[PDB]
Design a protein around this ligand. Sequence first.
Ligand code: ATP
Ligand code: CZA
Ligand code: K
Ligand code: MG
Ligand code: MG
Length: 994
Amino acid sequence: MEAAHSKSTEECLAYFGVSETTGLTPDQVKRHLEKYGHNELPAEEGKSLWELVIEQFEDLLVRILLLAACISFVLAWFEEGEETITAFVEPFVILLILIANAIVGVWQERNAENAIEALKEYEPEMGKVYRADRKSVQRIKARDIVPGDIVEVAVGDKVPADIRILSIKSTTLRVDQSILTGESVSVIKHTEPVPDPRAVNQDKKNMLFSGTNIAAGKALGIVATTGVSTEIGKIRDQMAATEQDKTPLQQKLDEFGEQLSKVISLICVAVWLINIGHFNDPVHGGSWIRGAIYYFKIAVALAVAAIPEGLPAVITTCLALGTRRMAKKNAIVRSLPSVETLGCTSVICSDKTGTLTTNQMSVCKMFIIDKVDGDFCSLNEFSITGSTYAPEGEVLKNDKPIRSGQFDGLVELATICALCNDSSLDFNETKGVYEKVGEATETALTTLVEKMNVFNTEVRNLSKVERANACNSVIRQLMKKEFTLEFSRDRKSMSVYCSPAKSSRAAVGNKMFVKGAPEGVIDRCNYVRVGTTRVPMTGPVKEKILSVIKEWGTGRDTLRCLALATRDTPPKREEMVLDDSSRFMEYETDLTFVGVVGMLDPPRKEVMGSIQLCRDAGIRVIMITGDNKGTAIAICRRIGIFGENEEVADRAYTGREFDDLPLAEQREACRRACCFARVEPSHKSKIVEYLQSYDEITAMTGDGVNDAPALKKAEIGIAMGSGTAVAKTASEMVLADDNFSTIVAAVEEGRAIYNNMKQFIRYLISSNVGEVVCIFLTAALGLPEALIPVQLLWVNLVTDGLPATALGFNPPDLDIMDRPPRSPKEPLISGWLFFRYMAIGGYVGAATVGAAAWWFMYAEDGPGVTYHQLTHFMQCTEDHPHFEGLDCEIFEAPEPMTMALSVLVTIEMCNALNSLSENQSLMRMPPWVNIWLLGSICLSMSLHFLILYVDPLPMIFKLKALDLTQWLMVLKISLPVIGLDEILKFIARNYLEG
Ligand SMILES: Nc1ncnc2c1ncn2[C@@H]1O[C@H](COP(=O)(O)OP(=O)(O)OP(=O)(O)O)[C@H](O)[C@H]1O
Ligand SMILES: CC(=O)C1=C(O)N2[C@H](C1=O)[C@H]1c3c[nH]c4cccc(c34)C[C@H]1C2(C)C
Ligand SMILES: [K+]
Ligand SMILES: [Mg+2]
Ligand SMILES: [Mg+2]
C-alpha cells in the first residue's frame, strides 16, 4: 500500500478489500504474509573478528610482506648446515608482526554495539488486531501483522507498523513521533486525506508510523506497509549501507600505502636489471641456485627496508593519547582514528533539538494586564530565566527581580497553569536532574509555577524530590479539579472545571480555567482581569493584547504563546455534557482574559560561542532539524548561524521546499543555505551526501534516531551524552556531558594529531629510504651484506619507534586554530619535504654502506683489498689464490654489519633531534626541549647495547660490540647528518618561503 495518506479511509479499506469491523480472514493473512513477508527490520549481524583480521591482509603493503615471510620461510628452511638453531626467526618475527599490526588495526575500530540492534528496540513485540475469525481484539506478535490488518493502538503503545488511521475513538489522538522528527511535542492526529503525494512525515497527520508511540487516546487503523517498507525501515536501510568507510587521514595513509608498494615493485625490476646486467658472466661453476636466491634474498631485504613496519604502533599510540585527552574533556571516542577527523572538517551539520538546544521547553516571558482606561491599555510584562525543567530561576520585571505573589494577576496565572495541566515534574535521584512527566509544554507550566512560588511557600529546605511539585500542590489544595474539558481541534483550547476545596457540590464559586491558542481564547473573552477586578474586553484592550502576542510570536523570540483565562461563572456541572466535545467551546465562552505565557526550547549556553570559534577556524555550521522553520530560524539567529536581522529567504528551507528543487538546485542549496527545517531522516543524510560531493569533509552532530542516517554518512558522527542509544552507536564520538564546546576542542586536538603524524612519518620514512639505499648498494655494487632483515625490523619497530612515539609529546602550536582547515587534496608529505627526507635517506644509505665498506679496507681490524676489490665476494675459494693473501669467511663477519647498523641507528638518533622542528634550526629551538625524546634515545641506545652485549642477542642479529675507536668513527659519520638537515633548514626558513 503506497500513498495511503493521500486517500480516504474507504479508499484504503477498499484497496485491501477489508471491513473495518471484522478484519482480514485468516486466508487473507496467509496470502498477505507470503506476499509481504514478516513485520520486522532484518538484523545486520556485523562482521565477526575472523573476517576482520582477514580483511586487514586485504591491502597490498601487507600482502607484500605476507609474501616475503613465506620466502624468508622458504629461506628459513633451506639453510646451510650452519646457523641452524634459529634461522627461522626471520619468517616468524615477520609473520608475528603481521598479526600484531593487524590485530591493532581491528582493535582500534572496536565496538560490539550494533546500531540496528538498538533500532529494533523500537519494534514492539506485540500488537493488537481485529480479524474475521474472532469478534474481539486479538493480541498477536507484531512481526505477524500484515498490510491490510485492522489494528488498534492506545496510550503508551508502540506503533507496530505504518498505518492509515481509520477512526479516532477518543477526542484526540496524541502521538510522540520523535524517532522521525527529533521533537517530543504531541502530534494531534486526524482521519482526513492529506492529498499532497509528497507530504513529509510531519504532514501525514492521518498516519501512525511504526516505532513511534501513542501519548494519548485510542485509535483504529488499517496497516499500509510493514517491515522494511516503513519510515523506520528507511532509517534502517541507511544504517546498513556499511560501505567500508575510512577517515580522510586513513585514506591518505592508504594512498601512501599504494605508492610505497609501487616503489618496492619498481626497485625489484631495477634490482632485477643491474643483476641481469651482470648475468652475462657467471663463469658457470656453482648452479643457478646461488643466483636464484640472490633476488629473493635482496627482494625480501628490499621490502623490510622500504616498509616502515612500526608506523601502526606509533600511529595507534598517537591516536590513543589523543583519545585519552579527549576523555578528560568528556568526549568519548569510540573509534580511535576519528579522534583526528574534526581537525580537517570543513562543514559541521547539526541537529537542533537536544543538541544545539536543551530540549527542555521553558516559559521565558509572560504577561498580565496592568491598567485599563478607554483606549489606553497597559500590560505588566515579565521575563523568567532558567532553561531547564528544574525549578531554579527568577522572575524579572525590567530585569529587576520580583515577587510574583505581589501581583494578583500572577497569582491567577500561576493558578491556571497549575490546574489546567496533566503533567508534573519529577526529580530523578539516580541522574540528579529534574525531568518532565507528561508533555513538555505542560511541564513548562509546572516549572513556571514552582519558579513563581506565588504564595511564598517555603522551599529553601525541601529535598529536591519534594521540591519538584511544592508550589503546584499548594495551588491544588485551594481548588479541586472535578474534570477536564479536554482539548479538541475545533476550539484550540482545553479546560478544567474546579470547585473551591471545602465547598459543597451546590456551593458558589466554581471556576473554569482555560488555556489555549491565543486567538480563539481571546475571542471568547468578554472581560479582562485587572489585579483582582474585571473590566470589559474592548477593542483596544484586545488590540493591545494581540499586539504583544504577535510580537512575541515572531522575533527571534518566535515563541509558542498560550492565552490563560477563567470562566468566572461557569455552567452548573449538571448542565454540561461531558461526552460531547463539540459542546466544549460553548462551555468555554463568556471568558475573563488573565495572561499569556511564551515558551521555547532554548540553546545550550556554550553553542553560540562554539559556533564563532568554528567560524574562526574556517568551519561552516549548518542546522538540520525536524522542527518547524520559524523556530529553526529563530534559534539560528539566537546562536549566531544568522545575524539578528539577516534576510534568509534563500538561506533556509523546509524538507518539502527542498524536495521541490531540482537535483542541481538541491545540491547548490546545501552550500548556500544554513537552515533546513521540518525534514525527514533521509533529508539529513542527503544534505550530507551533497556537501560531500563538493569534497568537503563533513561532520554531523545530533541525538535522535532521526539523526542516525546522517551521523553514519558524515566523515564523523558526534552524538550527545543524553540522547539516544541509536544516535550514540551510529556515532564515533559522544559528548558525555553534552558540552558543544568540546567540539572546538576536538578540532584542536585533530590538528595537533595530524601535525604529529606528519612529523614522525617524515622522520621514520627518512630512515626507511636510507635502508633501501644501503640494500641497493650492497647489491648493484655486488657487496657483502651491509644490513639484514632481522635487524631493520628492530630499528624499524623499536629503536626508531621509541623516539617517533616521543616526538608525540610536543605541546601543540599556538596558532593551529587560526587558519581554515587543510584541503582534502593536500598530500601528506609533499614537495620540499619529500626532497628533504630523500636527502636524509640517501645520506643514510651512503653512510651505512661506507662504515661497512670501511671496516673492510682502512680498518686495521680487517685489511681487505683496498682498491675496491671488496666488490668480489664471488671468488672466495673460487679464486682463493687470486687477489687474496688471507682468509675466506670474512664477509659474513658481524663487524661490517655492526658498523653499518650502528650508523643507521646513531644517524636516526640525530634525526630524532632534527625532527623536533620541521624548520627552526637546532640552533634556535634547543634540542633539550622534549625530554621524553632524549629519554627515548637512551632507552633506544641502551637497547642497542643489549643486542651487542646481553649474551644470546649478538648471534641472532649477528653483531659484535665495538672498539672505542669503532664507535668514534660511527660517530664521525653520523654527526654530520645535523648540518645536513640544517642546510635544508636555513634554505627553508629563508631562500624558500619567508
Ligand atoms: N492540550 C492543549 N491545551 C491547550 N492548547 C493546545 C493543546 N494541544 C495543542 N494546543 C494548541 O492548538 C495547537 C495543536 O497542534 P496543531 O495540530 O494545530 O499543529 P501546529 O501547531 O499548527 O504545527 P505543525 O505544523 O507541526 O502540524 C497549537 O499548536 C497549540 O498551541
Ligand atoms: C598486518 C597489517 O594489518 C598492517 C601492518 O602489519 N602493516 C600495516 C598494517 O595495516 C601496513 C600498511 C597499510 N598501509 C600503510 C601505510 C604506511 C605504513 C604501513 C601501511 C605499514 C604496513 C605493515 C605491513 C607494516
Ligand atoms: K560516520
Ligand atoms: Mg592493518
Ligand atoms: Mg535532536
